[PDB]
């Protein structure tokens, strides 16, 4: 996250670092918890990922450096990737991960809700990027999950700022007219949560932009709302 502010114990709790262990241990993606043994993240994560049998998922953590040679990690089972997905700029960036088993929730753990049913017409006007990526093009990986504010912007908007991408009704757009706070390297897969009526609702997850937080080329996030029959389907 570019222009964002750290975190602290159990303010994103929903937040998962899905880490590799090929051919060595790092932080691959965000995550976001949505059942107990279901994550909901993003296709082009796992364009290296050999088997879902590398793959931890780490729940509870505000700093990556918490995580330890014993700290305990859930297994995945499976790795469900949108069938008419091929590279994150087309579209269909969207994967559940099936845990191995399942999660007890906590104050460090919980479950965010996904859009609801009938509120296909809400303006969300609270929405939030979080992660433990560059502060900039060119940095490394955060010690502690980061936060950031950031409006939406219309998919017209999105379209006038990147007239060589195709910009769908499946993709939702962040970010400021002059820059500055985004999402980038590293966080992807995780979640854009917006607050609605005080709940939390999983708006849309990190994808793809052109740089990260430069100037009228705001972030593009999967839209989740266009999902949630594909993912009922697939969780139920
Ligand atoms: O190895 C390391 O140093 C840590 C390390 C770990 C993960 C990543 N991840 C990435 O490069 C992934 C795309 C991707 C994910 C997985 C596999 C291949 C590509 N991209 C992102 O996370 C941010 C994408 C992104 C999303 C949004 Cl909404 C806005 C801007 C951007 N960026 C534009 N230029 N950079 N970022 C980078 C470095």
Redesign the pocket.
């Given at each position: 996250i570019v222009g964002g502010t750290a975190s602290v114990r159990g303010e994103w709790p929903w937040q998962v670092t899905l880490h590799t262990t090929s051919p060595t241990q790092?932080?691959?993606?965000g995550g976001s918890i949505i059942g107990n043994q279901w994550i909901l993240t993003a296709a082009?994560?796992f364009?290296?990922v050999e088997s879902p049998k590398i793959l931890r998922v780490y729940s509870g953590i505000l700093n990556q450096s918490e995580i330890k040679e014993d700290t305990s990690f859930f297994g995945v089972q499976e790795i469900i990737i949108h069938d008419q997905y091929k590279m994150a700029e087309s579209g269909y960036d969207i994967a559940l991960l099936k845990l191995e088993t399942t999660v007890n929730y906590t104050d460090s753990q919980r479950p965010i809700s996904l859009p609801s049913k009938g509120d296909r017409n809400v303006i969300y006007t609270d929405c939030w990027v979080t992660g433990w990526?560059y502060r900039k093009?060119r940095d490394?990986?955060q010690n502690t999950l980061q936060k950031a504010k950031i409006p939406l912007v219309t998919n017209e908007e999105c379209q006038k700022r990147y007239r060589g991408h195709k910009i769908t009704h499946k993709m939702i757009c962040a970010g400021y007219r002059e820059g500055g706070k985004?999402?980038?390297?590293?966080?992807?897969g995780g979640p854009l949560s917006c607050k609605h009526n005080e709940v939390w609702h999983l708006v849309g997850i990190?994808?793809?932009?052109?740089?990260?937080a430069q100037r009228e080329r705001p972030?593009?996030?999967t839209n989740v709302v266009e999902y949630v029959d594909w993912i009922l389907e697939k969780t139920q």
């Amino acid at each position: 996250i570019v222009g964002g502010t750290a975190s602290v114990r159990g303010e994103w709790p929903w937040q998962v670092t899905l880490h590799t262990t090929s051919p060595t241990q790092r932080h691959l993606c965000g995550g976001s918890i949505i059942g107990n043994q279901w994550i909901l993240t993003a296709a082009h994560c796992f364009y290296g990922v050999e088997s879902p049998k590398i793959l931890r998922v780490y729940s509870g953590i505000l700093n990556q450096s918490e995580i330890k040679e014993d700290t305990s990690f859930f297994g995945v089972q499976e790795i469900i990737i949108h069938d008419q997905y091929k590279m994150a700029e087309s579209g269909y960036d969207i994967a559940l991960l099936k845990l191995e088993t399942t999660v007890n929730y906590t104050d460090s753990q919980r479950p965010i809700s996904l859009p609801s049913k009938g509120d296909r017409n809400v303006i969300y006007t609270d929405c939030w990027v979080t992660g433990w990526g560059y502060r900039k093009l060119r940095d490394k990986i955060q010690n502690t999950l980061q936060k950031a504010k950031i409006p939406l912007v219309t998919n017209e908007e999105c379209q006038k700022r990147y007239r060589g991408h195709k910009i769908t009704h499946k993709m939702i757009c962040a970010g400021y007219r002059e820059g500055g706070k985004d999402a980038c390297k590293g966080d992807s897969g995780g979640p854009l949560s917006c607050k609605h009526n005080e709940v939390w609702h999983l708006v849309g997850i990190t994808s793809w932009g052109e740089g990260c937080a430069q100037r009228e080329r705001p972030g593009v996030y999967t839209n989740v709302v266009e999902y949630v029959d594909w993912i009922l389907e697939k969780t139920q």
